[PDB]
Amino acid sequence: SLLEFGKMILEETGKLAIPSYSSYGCYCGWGGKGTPKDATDRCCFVHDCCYGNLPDCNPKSDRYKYKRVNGAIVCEKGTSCENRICECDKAAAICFRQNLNTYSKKYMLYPDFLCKGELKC
């Protein structure tokens, strides 16, 4: 569920998923199309890409459980949809953490028309 992801995001970056990440660039939050504007945007692209490999799971509403082993995010055994979802979120969390230094606010609330071009996952 978005609950676990959002929390994972906040612990990791200290920023709130909504709104620091729900509308960022071309891929954070909406998905659809375009060329990721930047590293964080790529994190969302590869994320939207991750959920794409689980066609029969429900990322937004299926709740999984994780723990921190000293700072590490550790997904706990759950259904397999739950496990594979959790891994996809950990990546994003990490990825965001790895590029906070270039998170730019000129991408917050980015208008859709500026998002065009192709990208295949």
Ligand SMILES: COc1ccc2c(c1)c(CC(=O)O)c(C)n2C(=O)c1ccc(Cl)cc1
């Ligand atoms: C390309 O990226 C995707 C693909 C599928 C997705 C999502 C994002 C999100 C999250 C979102 O992008 O809001 C949800 C909840 N998806 C599904 O549950 C889903 C369920 C049935 C089918 Cl047939 C296809 C997808």
Ligand SMILES: CS(=O)(=O)Nc1ccc([N+](=O)[O-])cc1Oc1ccccc1
């Ligand atoms: C997945 S969505 O429909 O594209 N919108 C949405 C996007 C991201 C997040 N979130 O917490 O990262 C939360 C989101 O939706 C919420 C809005 C209000 C309260 C809880 C979740």
